[PDB]
Amino acid sequence: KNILKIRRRKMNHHKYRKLVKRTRFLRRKVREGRLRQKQVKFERDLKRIWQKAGLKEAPAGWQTPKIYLKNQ
């Protein structure tokens, strides 16, 4: 019967939900690490825009927000 496939998917999900719990703080470090590079790479993309347009400095009053930051 099809139960031979639901059980196989049950064990994999049950083992994955223990791999996250055992190494929860390892994922916390990596997630924040990827978020910093995500923000930094976004800054370089905006920095490329104004440099190629001929300007020397970013337009006055423009401070790039940290979109990938925890807020509410």
Partner RNA sequence: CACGAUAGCUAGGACCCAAACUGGGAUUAGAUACCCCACUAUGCCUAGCCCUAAACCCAAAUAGUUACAUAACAAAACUAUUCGCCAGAGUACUACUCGCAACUGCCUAAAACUCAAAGGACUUGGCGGUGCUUCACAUCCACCUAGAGGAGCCUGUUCUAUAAUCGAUAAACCCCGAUAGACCUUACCAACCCUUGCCAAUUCAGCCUAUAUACCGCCAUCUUCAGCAAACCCUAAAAAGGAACAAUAGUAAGCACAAUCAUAGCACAUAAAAACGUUAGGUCAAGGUGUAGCUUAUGGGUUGGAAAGAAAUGGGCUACAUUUUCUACAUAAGAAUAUCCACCACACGAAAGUUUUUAUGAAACUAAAAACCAAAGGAGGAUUUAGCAGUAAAUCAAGAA
Partner RNA sequence: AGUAAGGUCAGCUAAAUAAGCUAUCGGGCCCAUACCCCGAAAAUGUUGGUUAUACCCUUCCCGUACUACCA
Partner RNA sequence: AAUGAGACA
Binding-site members for Mg(2+) are 12
The secondary structure of 2-66 as a DSSP string is THHHHHHHHHHHHHHHHHHHHTHHHHHHHHHHHHHHHHHHHHHHHHHHHHHTT-SSPPTT-----
Binding mask of the shown chain, residues 12 to 41, with x at each position contacting RNA by CB under 7 A: xx--x---xx--x--xx-xxx-x---x---
Asked if 44 interacts with RNA (CB under 7 A), we say: no
Binding site for RNA (CB under 7 A): 1-6, 8-10, 12-13, 16, 20-21, 24, 27-28, 30-32, 34, 38, 67, 69-70, 72
